Amino acid sequence: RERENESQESHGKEYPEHLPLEVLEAGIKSGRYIQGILNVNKHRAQIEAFVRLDILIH
RNA sequence: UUUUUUUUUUUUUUUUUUUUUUUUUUCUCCUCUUUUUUUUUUUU
Numbered sequence: 001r002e003r004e005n006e007s008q009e010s011h012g013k014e015y016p017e018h019l020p021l022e023v024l025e026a027g028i029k030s031g032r033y034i035q036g037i038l039n040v041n042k043h044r045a046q047i048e049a050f051v052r053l054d055i056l057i058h
Numbered sequence: 059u060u061u062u063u064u065u066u067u068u069u070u071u072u073u074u075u076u077u078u079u080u081u082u083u084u085c086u087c088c089u090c091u092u093u094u095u096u097u098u099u100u101u102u
Contacts, residue, residue: 043091
C-alpha cells in the first residue's frame with residue numbers, strides 16, 4: 001500500500017533543475033546566497049555532506 | 059586378260075564512359091558503522 005504511494009508521490013523528476021548565473025550574481029549581491037567549498041564524511045557517505053562556510057546537508 | 063571419275067581447313071575489326079572510409083538499436087540499477095576531519099616543528 002506504501003509502494004503505490006511512494007511511487008506516485010515521485011512523479012517524473014529526481015533532482016531540482018538548475019538555472020542561469022545572472023540569477024546567482026544578483027542573489028549574492030542582494031545578500032541571500034553564501035558560497036563555499038563542500039566536503040563529505042566517509043564513514044557515512046550518502047548522508048553526511050558538509051558545506052564549509054558548517055551547513056549539514058542531509 | 060580387270061579401264062574411267064568423284065573441289066576444300068568461318069567471312070570481319072581502326073569501341074564512348076565525367077567516382078571515394080563507414081553504412082543500422084537494447085532498459086532502470088541500496089557502495090555497512092570510533093569520529094570531529096588531523097595539520098606547528100626539524101632532519102631529504
